[PDB]
Amino acid sequence: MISLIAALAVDRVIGMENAMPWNLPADLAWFKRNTLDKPVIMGRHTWESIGRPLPGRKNIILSSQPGTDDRVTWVKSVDEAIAACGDVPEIMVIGGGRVYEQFLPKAQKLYLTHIDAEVEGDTHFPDYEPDDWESVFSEFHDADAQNSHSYCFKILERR
Amino acid sequence: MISLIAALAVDRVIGMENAMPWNLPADLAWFKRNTLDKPVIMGRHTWESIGRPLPGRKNIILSSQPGTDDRVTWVKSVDEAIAACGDVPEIMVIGGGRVYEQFLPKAQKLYLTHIDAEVEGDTHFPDYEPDDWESVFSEFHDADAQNSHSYCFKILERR
Numbered sequence: 529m530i531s532l533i534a535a536l537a538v539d540r541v542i543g544m545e546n547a548m549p550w551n552l553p554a555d556l557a558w559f560k561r562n563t564l565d566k567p568v569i570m571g572r573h574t575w576e577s578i579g580r581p582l583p584g585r586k587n588i589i590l591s592s593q594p595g596t597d598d599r600v601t602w603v604k605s606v607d608e609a610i611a612a613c614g615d616v617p618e619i620m621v622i623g624g625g626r627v628y629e630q631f632l633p634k635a636q637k638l639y640l641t642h643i644d645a646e647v648e649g650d651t652h653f654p655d656y657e658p659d660d661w662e663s664v665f666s667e668f669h670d671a672d673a674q675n676s677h678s679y680c681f682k683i684l685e686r687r
Numbered sequence: 688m689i690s691l692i693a694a695l696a697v698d699r700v701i702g703m704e705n706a707m708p709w710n711l712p713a714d715l716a717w718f719k720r721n722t723l724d725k726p727v728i729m730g731r732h733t734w735e736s737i738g739r740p741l742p743g744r745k746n747i748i749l750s751s752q753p754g755t756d757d758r759v760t761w762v763k764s765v766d767e768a769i770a771a772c773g774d775v776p777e778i779m780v781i782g783g784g785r786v787y788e789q790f791l792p793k794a795q796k797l798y799l800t801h802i803d804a805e806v807e808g809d810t811h812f813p814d815y816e817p818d819d820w821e822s823v824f825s826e827f828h829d830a831d832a833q834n835s836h837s838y839c840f841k842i843l844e845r846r
């Protein structure tokens with residue numbers, strides 16, 4: 529199954545020119561708890577920002593341009609991309625926008641982090657039909673000694 | 688010699704309790720490199736925000752209350768705090784506000800990271816009359832993929 533996992537600011541902003549202006553170690557811990565021992569499919573921009581292969585997950589970069597790290601697989605198409613990961617129960621799309629638009633249609637579940645942060649964006653999370661999705665998990669939290677904005681984690685399943 | 692190390696947003700705005708609205712691994716690398724192998728003094732809020740002893744550093748918490756962890760030294764006064772090290776070449780004060788305010792008059796060096804982030808706050812780094820300080824090192828940096836904003840590194844010596 530294909531799942532999408534994203535941190536969204538107010539208005540569905542998922543990326544900037546630069547790093548987002550939030551420090552959410554809890555958002556990372558949720559990110560990891562849900563991506564571990566799973567194949568993660570990302571684009572190049574995001575790969576350039578993670579800094580390295582993610583530990584304990586099969587890194588897959590979806591891109592028309594190639595062959596830079598030895599430590600991740602390099603796929604050129606979604607179709608290929610899907611296979612490169614395999615016969616797995618669930619594949620994780622970790623963005624950015626472009627990969628998001630393309631995997632959506634196939635998406636059966638969404639893992640979202642709603643961050644209360646107003647940012648002028650560059651990329652956005654495609655527009656999903658809130659009618660098409662069902663919320664099966666929700667959990668709100670306030671900013672604290674380590675998290676700079678309040679956030680809410682949610683899981684949607686395609687209706 | 689006592690030094691203060693602070694990251695400040697526009698208007699000398701510093702953190703009060705919740706994490707600051709930014710992601711600057713460059714600022715943390717600078718912090719490390721400048722504090723490693725030295726004693727660091729801080730308040731109860733900063734400690735909670737760090738949340739573990741800084742490695743390679745002698746951790747001193749200047750609170751007025753109850754020593755909660757044995758892996759750290761718990762003073763109660765400026766006096767107690769200094770002594771607590773004896774004779775080292777440099778003592779670093781890593782904040783918050785109140786600590787800045789009580790060590791400034793004994794401080795002869797400042798390592799400041801100036802961040803182009805308009806952020807809102809009650810607290811501010813204490814006011815230092817530049818006729819008592821010399822800009823000795825300065826170096827700007829553009830925001831990037833790993834760092835949300837622009838920052839300027841700066842060391843000033845008390846004259």
Ligand SMILES: CN(Cc1cnc2nc(N)nc(N)c2n1)c1ccc(C(=O)N[C@@H](CCC(=O)O)C(=O)O)cc1
Nearest residue numbers: 533534535555556557559560577578582583622623641
């Ligand atoms: C820039 N970024 C891409 C990124 C960031 N946050 C997101 N957060 C959510 N919810 N979802 C996204 N898809 C996600 N993507 C990163 C940056 C670092 C980490 C990483 O360093 N995470 C550690 C866990 C956290 C820490 O231990 O360093 C990892 O094991 O996954 C992953 C993605």
Ligand SMILES: CN(Cc1cnc2nc(N)nc(N)c2n1)c1ccc(C(=O)N[C@@H](CCC(=O)O)C(=O)O)cc1
Nearest residue numbers: 692693694714715716718719736737741742781782800
């Ligand atoms: C929230 N907090 C207070 C803190 C944050 N940055 C500041 N930045 C400056 N320049 N100075 C301050 N006094 C300051 N102190 C922290 C947070 C984490 C780290 C800690 O994780 N530092 C690692 C180095 C950084 C990388 O380890 O993640 C350490 O070894 O210093 C310390 C400071």
Ligand SMILES: [Ca+2]
Nearest residue numbers: 662663664665
């Ligand atoms: Ca429901």
Ligand SMILES: [Cl-]
Nearest residue numbers: 571573574624
């Ligand atoms: Cl990307």
Ligand SMILES: [Cl-]
Nearest residue numbers: 730732733783
């Ligand atoms: Cl403090």
